[PDB]
């Protein structure tokens, strides 16, 4: 017919290249439902994510644009691989959906947290996140939204990061949730939490909303420094400064031996170093928090360190693009469209 065709997966219509068969729903990442599919040409499992009229709204479009450009221009063993993009509508007039085809991993970290890792796994996984993160950063991209749902792993122990349709609940760094102003290590809090979660084997802060975290968080790490409170908005300083005050617990009492696996044959892969790294990462005040390089140089992580993994040449953006403008509906559509057509 016209290369495309249509299946109903529940209430959603996927329209895709005939080469993509046997679609199964596998989940929904921020801005789109995603199908697993068999790719008849490559002879390979793939993943198809659909963004239905992504130009709909200011929010949506900003993110979809970011995601598009980024997914093109960024390439690395620890960042989900792009394989194909398309719309099945044959004109800018008639264009409404975008389809991004990616590699299919086995699972999201949700997931690894659940099971009982040895140290070389915990470390290696973490090393892989950090390396992927260093890559994004080396081109001034800051993810701001790293969490287990948006990080995927394979049953050969590789890990890749999904998502920049947010990149530029309590996994987000405080500097971020407190409208505070941020920097690259805003992504290191994310990792600190995730590692913390890997060790504990479940949720780190048994806390519901995007400020019921806060209390469970401060309850445990302890109320942040006075001369960090300044840095806050008077709007916000009031709220924080008003909360009860907590001493916190040591990292030994928060992450005690019993929770870690046996100290490995290897020198540096020990609960005392893991605890060390963690306590340098899971810090509330960003200017007191370790950077990605330091985390990479840290005895727990550096055992895998590989200059050719970690020091790849940055992606290069046009910096013409860096969402430095808001737009109207029409323009976005055109932009996305240009961008998608550019990707065919």
């Amino acid at each position: 017919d016209n290369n495309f065709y249509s299946v109903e997966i529940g209430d959603s219509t996927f329209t895709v290249l005939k080469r993509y068969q046997n679609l199964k729903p596998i989940g929904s990442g921020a801005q789109g439902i995603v199908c697993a599919a068999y790719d008849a040409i490559l002879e390979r499992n793939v993943a198809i994510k659909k963004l239905s009229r992504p130009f709909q709204n200011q929010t949506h479009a900003k993110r979809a644009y970011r995601e598009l450009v980024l997914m093109k221009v960024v390439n690395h063993k620890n960042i989900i691989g792009l394989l194909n993009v398309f719309t099945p509508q044959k004109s800018l007039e008639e264009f409404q959906d975008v389809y991004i085809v990616m590699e299919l991993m086995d699972a999201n970290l949700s997931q690894v947290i659940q099971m009982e890792l040895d140290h070389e796994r915990m470390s290696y996984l973490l090393y892989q996140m950090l390396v992927g993160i260093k890559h994004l950063h080396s081109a001034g991209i800051i993810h701001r939204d790293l969490k287990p749902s948006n990080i995927v792993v394979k049953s050969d122990a590789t890990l890749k990061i999904l998502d920049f349709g947010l990149a530029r609940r309590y996994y987000r760094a405080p500097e971020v949730i407190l409208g505070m102003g941020y920097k690259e290590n805003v992504d290191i809090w994310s990792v600190g939490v995730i590692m913390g979660e890997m060790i504990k084997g479940g949720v780190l802060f048994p806390g519901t909303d995007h400020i019921d975290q806060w209390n469970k968080v401060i309850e445990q790490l302890g109320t942040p420094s006075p001369e960090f409170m300044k840095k806050l908005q008077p709007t916000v300083r009031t709220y924080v400064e008003n909360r009860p005050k907590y001493a916190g617990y040591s990292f030994e009492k928060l992450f005690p031996d019993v929770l870690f696996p046996a100290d490995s044959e290897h020198n540096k892969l020990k609960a005392s170093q893991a605890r060390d790294l963690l306590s340098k990462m899971l810090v509330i005040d960003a200017s007191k928090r370790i950077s990605v390089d330091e985390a990479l140089q840290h005895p727990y992580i550096n055992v895998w360190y590989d200059p050719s993994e970690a020091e790849a040449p940055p992606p290069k953006i046009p910096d013409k693009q860096l969402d430095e403008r808001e737009h109207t509906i029409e323009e976005w559509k055109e932009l996305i469209y240009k961008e998608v057509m550019d990707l065919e």
């Binding site: 690894v112 290696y124 792993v153 394979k154 122990a157 895998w304």
Partner: peptide
């Protein structure tokens, strides 16, 4: 210190 190559997704 060798890189793991398996990971059990049970």
């Amino acid at each position: 210190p060798k890189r793991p190559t398996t990971l059990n997704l049970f």
